[PDB]
Amino acid sequence: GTTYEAETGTTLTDAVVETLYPGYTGSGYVNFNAYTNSAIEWNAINNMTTGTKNVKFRYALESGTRNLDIYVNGTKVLSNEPFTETGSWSTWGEKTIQVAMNSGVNTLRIVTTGTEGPNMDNITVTAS
Numbered sequence: 001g002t003t004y005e006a007e008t009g010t011t012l013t014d015a016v017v018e019t020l021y022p023g024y025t026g027s028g029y030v031n032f033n034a035y036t037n038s039a040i041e042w043n044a045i046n047n048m049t050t051g052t053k054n055v056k057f058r059y060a061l062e063s064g065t066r067n068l069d070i071y072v073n074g075t076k077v078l079s080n081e082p083f084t085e086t087g088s089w090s091t092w093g094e095k096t097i098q099v100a101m102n103s104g105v106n107t108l109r110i111v112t113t114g115t116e117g118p119n120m121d122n123i124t125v126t127a128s
């Protein structure tokens with residue numbers, strides 16, 4: 001698998017890099033600021049093969065469920081995917097989705113749709 005930090009190699013839309021809550025990997029995590037249309041886009045996810053991939057998000061969410069649209073290569077492939085609470089802003093949980101990606105370089109973008117977002121540490125991409 002390959003781990004891609006949320007805070008580096010990404011384009012942020014109404015979302016900022018923060019370090020307030022400890023336990024993140026790399027240099028920080030991404031805090032989504034807007035309830036709708038905050039986004040993190042990974043511009044350079046690089047895969048060995050075309051097929052189903054496990055994308056495992058490491059994130060924190062004190063309480064409640066926050067839903068995100070998920071796009072792969074500009075196309076929306078998940079609609080309001082639920083991210084459930086970890087219990088505390090310094091409890092970093094994991095959520096794994098299964099999505100199709102191509103071999104070579106891909107984009108992945110996650111977007112708030114009404115419930116804002118979890119604080120997003122990183123993703124790890126492995127072949128399913």
Ligand SMILES: [Ca+2]
Nearest residue numbers: 031032033116
């Ligand atoms: Ca936020």
Ligand SMILES: [Ca+2]
Nearest residue numbers: 025026028121
């Ligand atoms: Ca991070």
